Design a protein around this ligand. Sequence first.
Ligand SMILES: [Zn+2]
Lengths: 481, 150, 219, 351, 352
Amino acid sequence: NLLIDNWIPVRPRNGGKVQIINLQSLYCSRDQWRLSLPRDDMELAALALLVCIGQIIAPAKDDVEFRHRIMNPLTEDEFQQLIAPWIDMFYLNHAEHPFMQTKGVKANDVTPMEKLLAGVSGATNCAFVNQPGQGEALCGGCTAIALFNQANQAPGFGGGFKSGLRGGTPVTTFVRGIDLRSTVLLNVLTLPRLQKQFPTENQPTWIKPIKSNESIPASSIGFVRGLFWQPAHIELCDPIGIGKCSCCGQESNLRYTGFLKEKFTFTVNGLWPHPHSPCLVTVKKGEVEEKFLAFTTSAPSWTQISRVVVDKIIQNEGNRVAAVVNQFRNIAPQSPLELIMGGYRNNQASILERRHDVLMGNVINEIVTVGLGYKTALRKALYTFAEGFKNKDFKGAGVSVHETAERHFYRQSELLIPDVLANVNFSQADEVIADLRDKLHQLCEMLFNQSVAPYAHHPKLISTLALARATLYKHLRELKP
Amino acid sequence: DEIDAMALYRAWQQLDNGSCAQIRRVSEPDELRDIPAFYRLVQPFGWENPRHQQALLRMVFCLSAGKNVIRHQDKKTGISLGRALANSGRINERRIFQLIRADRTADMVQLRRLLTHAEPVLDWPLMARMLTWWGKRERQQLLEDFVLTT
Amino acid sequence: MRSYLILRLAGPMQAWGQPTFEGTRPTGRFPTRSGLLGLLGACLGIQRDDTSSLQALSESVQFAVRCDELILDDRRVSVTGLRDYHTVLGAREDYRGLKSHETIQTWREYLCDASFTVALWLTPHATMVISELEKAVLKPRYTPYLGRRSCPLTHPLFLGTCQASDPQKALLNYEPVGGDIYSEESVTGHHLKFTARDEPMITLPRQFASREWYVIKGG
Amino acid sequence: SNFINIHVLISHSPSCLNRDDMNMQKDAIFGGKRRVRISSQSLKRAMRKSGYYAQNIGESSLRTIHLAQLRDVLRQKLGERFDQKIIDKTLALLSGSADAVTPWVVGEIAWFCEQVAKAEADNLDDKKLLKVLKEDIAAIRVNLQQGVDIALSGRMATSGMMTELGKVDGAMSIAHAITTHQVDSDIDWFTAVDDLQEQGSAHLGTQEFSSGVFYRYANINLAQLQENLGGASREQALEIATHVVHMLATEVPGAKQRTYAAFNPADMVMVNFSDMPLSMANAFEKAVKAKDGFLQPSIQAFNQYWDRVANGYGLNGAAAQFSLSDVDPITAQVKQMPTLEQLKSWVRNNG
Amino acid sequence: SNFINIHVLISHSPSCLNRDDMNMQKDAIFGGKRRVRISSQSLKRAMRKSGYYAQNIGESSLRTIHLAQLRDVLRQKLGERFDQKIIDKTLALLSGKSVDEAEKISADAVTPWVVGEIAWFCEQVAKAEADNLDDKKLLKVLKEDIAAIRVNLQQGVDIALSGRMATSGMMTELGKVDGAMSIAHAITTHQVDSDIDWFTAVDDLQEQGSAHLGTQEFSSGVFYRYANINLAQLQENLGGASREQALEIATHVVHMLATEVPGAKQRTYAAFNPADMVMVNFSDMPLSMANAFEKAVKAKDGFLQPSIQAFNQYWDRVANGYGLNGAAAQFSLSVKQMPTLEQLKSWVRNNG
DNA sequence: GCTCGATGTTTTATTTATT
Ligand SMILES: [Zn+2]
């Protein structure tokens, strides 16, 4: 039981050895913890799970109690009081309602644990490039975490398997605290905002199951049914004895070795108001449409400061912040706000990329702003080239050049970043940023010329090419102050 | 340090009929090394210094197209050569391709032929900078200016 | 003062990893801790299953990397990046048997015109001595390379030995000076930190735990 | 010394010997300038799949590994983790006086021993075990008849190997081939003419292609080669090394060769022994400028570089250089070879 | 020996035998110097469409992307042997495209077809649907024996020498041919600065001046053609032909490579020059001599003599260095001395 | 031991410069 037993993988904020604690030890002590796992994305899945749990067991009645609970840990009594019915809802190995599972799965073979590990399998190159046997024996915690991550962040297993309410691969955006406890409490909506957010069947999908081929209005899903939503038919196998978890390397009494899955489709009409992801607001006809943010053709990320990149992309480019973030803004508007964020880039069922910033000033923001400026310059230029290329009845990868160029841009610029970070201070900021501008100008010229290179000696495309380059320089010209 | 292109322009402009007639009948840039009038023309513009030598060979060839073929016109960057060639409306695009794809010495001959045809109005020091460098970038730029203008 | 061992990692192409479980094999700007432990581990005769001496090396040695800008003819040459479209024919379809895919794809990133100078010392409770590490880098048992086996060395691994207070001074003894230094040990007038996930979880083969470099800029 | 360094300068006629996902010539920035590139994997495949390789390495004498002769050393090695019953049962079911043993053999056999032990514990045998482990056994058998290929080039993409000890690196390391000079590649604007179309062609396209003077580098870990050949001798390792030299001097990737046909041999081959393997690629860090071709200035630059840095870099040791040109030679410390064969024999006799 | 290496040194008077998108001579940078180039595809098509090829080897394949026109042609040619339906379905099975009565039906790409091969195929289709054998199983059965189809390639040798691929239809599985031969682009042994022809078109209704003023790139050249035939592969691609047949084909390739020159601008430049030097050599693995001209041949009483000399010198250097001793015959005119090309051809015919 | 086929999901960003 997640709410009782030890499963949370932690190590002291600035300390050493990994230990495994329980929810009470987390909620009822001034100990500074941080999650500790071999994988950033699993750390994000863990934090997401804890945030959801806290969201259903202890919403503050007002902002005052919110701040109060953040600055002051509960007593153990209050905790138990808060967790009882939810105690009954959280069992990994149970009779009728296993955690995020479905009893009575009809399958011929047992699915290996690797299918829950988000990138270990999914593609052919996976078999060739990854270390084998990463999922031969997973402890309880890693199993719960993996299940949740598969229910939210990862794409479905394959044909006949559905993805989360936020779509296949969404970006998750959390408010970053000083330690773990603070982070969890920080990303929990207060009761009033919770009501304003969810204006239903408020029972889990592993207690009140989904009906095959049924249509479900998104408005008809309770918030605990959605926060703990489960779209594929999964059922763990019986665990094994004491040994090392093949995923986290820790010792554990119970280790799971496989599970049973089966195809299961339905339909959720409309968009469930999930509080953990930013979204894009489009106006179509006269109606307002929203789509959750996802790493589509590129996953914007610089080393050390990816969270800033994402934050600025959400702030500046009609993107709307996540609900927990909006709440935090409204509670502490004058307070600085850094994100804990994560997401995958995927071909269908195969992951292509992972970007995850999970850690626990104005110059950096300026830097990111500049970078994105040059990125946009290049993208507009090469989209001009792309459209011109299409309209000229040409075929091939001439259309999708802007996407590849964007990805490449992020890479090379990431080669540029560490020195920039190293030389930044009060007096040197303007100069290092100027040098950065020069470098990025050069890099944009290079990536434009490179992405356009395979279409030399194509006499027609000259018109297109010309326009394209002009566009680039226009924007580049607009980027020098 | 940098060649006074306007000074070279006016110099070429008020050159006597003879010296001019001698420079004009050259059929490729290097042949300008056989004409004394050439040396007397380009000597005050740094000819005794090699880099300037190559640059000046190109410039003086293009000018050797004739006294009244390249009309300098001040800036309001200024009219680039590609823009000028397009503005004339006489030059086919294919010829511009053949120009920017050509190799050494041939490029200057073809350019002089183009200049003779178009009789372009342009910022001469600008074209002078272009001729000074004349890398692949400059040739591509020539072509793209020419295209964007039409 | 402690004894340092100074190394040089130069070559046309290098590859220092970032977290991945995909066909994309990314590179960092400077050598990774696990990559360095692997270079040393290759100089010594440590097999991949010898977790004992693997852990001994891991607990005996700490590093300090300096990034050296290539100067050529008085002109500076910046470190570029390279993307390699690396396909594999007849790649394993599964972790056992002999079934294979016709073609599979990978994309691998390299550093071009990169060169580094590594400072190496011993932990207070180390097992080995810098003498045998010197012998190792002078006569390696396994072929040493810069990240990937397709990346040879153009300058001898061994650069020198010296004594000194901090890694910055030790590295100051060796040209080219001025590169940014990323060290596992702090240094007084510098407080920057560079988070990374390259501390090899050894007891869990091929896994990686988080750690942080101390960033120290050059003049 | 333990390492054999192999340096090759080889000039190719206009061709496209290695491209990417956009059908563009592979390149690399070196010394701030663009060099055309032939990837390590393409070169090493060009070797490993070649007929010469198959004849001299594939059909080698040390090729076949007999599990029978390996019984005793296996019996002690695994004897600490397994008892002789399981070990002999394993060995016998796999097969159906050796001194040492190749590590991957020990590893894979140990895994099989784990499997048969766990097979006895659960109470099982017969075709049950021989059907669970059918494919695995097939694999290890096919690998047991390819010992030299595995020792030299490493395990295949699809091997069947199952242990950390069965992650067999090749003994040879092949760097990416890069040109000694800057290259702006050429473009071929081609048409495909339709025999049923009156006006115009049926297809139009471009193909990037270039000449280039390439610098191949490769080194051979002798110790690791011997050890991966079941404790073979230095001499046999030197024979294998001879073959590697030959292949690196003559083999060329088949990419786009049907239409550009760059079937060129190496104009220079040098081999030297060292304790520390080094690439002489920095001989071309400052891109070689052409003086009556790119070949002569390349070889000359190589020679001058060696003369400059070989002493300090600790490259003292045996060194021979076969060459087709008459450019001023290296330091006299390097023994000149008039035919490739004399160089290979120089290698056979330990230098 | 398995490989037949054909080396040709051929001099062309002023001309323009191969140009690009902008009607300028094709070139190539070799040894840091510009060489004029004749692309390999130009040489191959020049050969396959030649009279010699037609008289000695047979019919060139039919390369097209227009499947409708092809449908009509096959109907006109295979009509008295098969009923229209079978022809249609056969084309539709090989191409993967639906063959109805549309005005325009387009294939995936330009593809070479052999009419005889198609005839054999529709025989198989007839006997397939007659025996109530569906298309998939037919694909399996035909996949079991490809040699026959390659004897149908004996009816289209240029496909056996140069290769064929298809991305759609049963051809994908059955028509995958790796070329037997192999051929390089003809590059000059010396640096070339191409001349430009300033021409006018005189109008007979315009007294003043001309009606057209233009320029045309051209040059002279001593080109180095190289081409090796793979042979065992030629036997495979022909359905299992003998070595004699492959050797004779190779001989014809020698004659053509020695004598055939692309017709580009020849009605106005007429560089109908035969090869001054021809050399054939048997070897275990392919060997090109282009590095004899890596250092550009400097002129000395012409470009041809120093080119041939440089060729010989490099040939000796390579033969001595790598210890090559495959049979070789040179024909020269300016290893063997071949007073006549014919003796060299018979020498090739007879396995060297 | 497979090949077969229907199937889980979801994309769009522009449009004139000058080393
Ligand atoms: Zn675990």
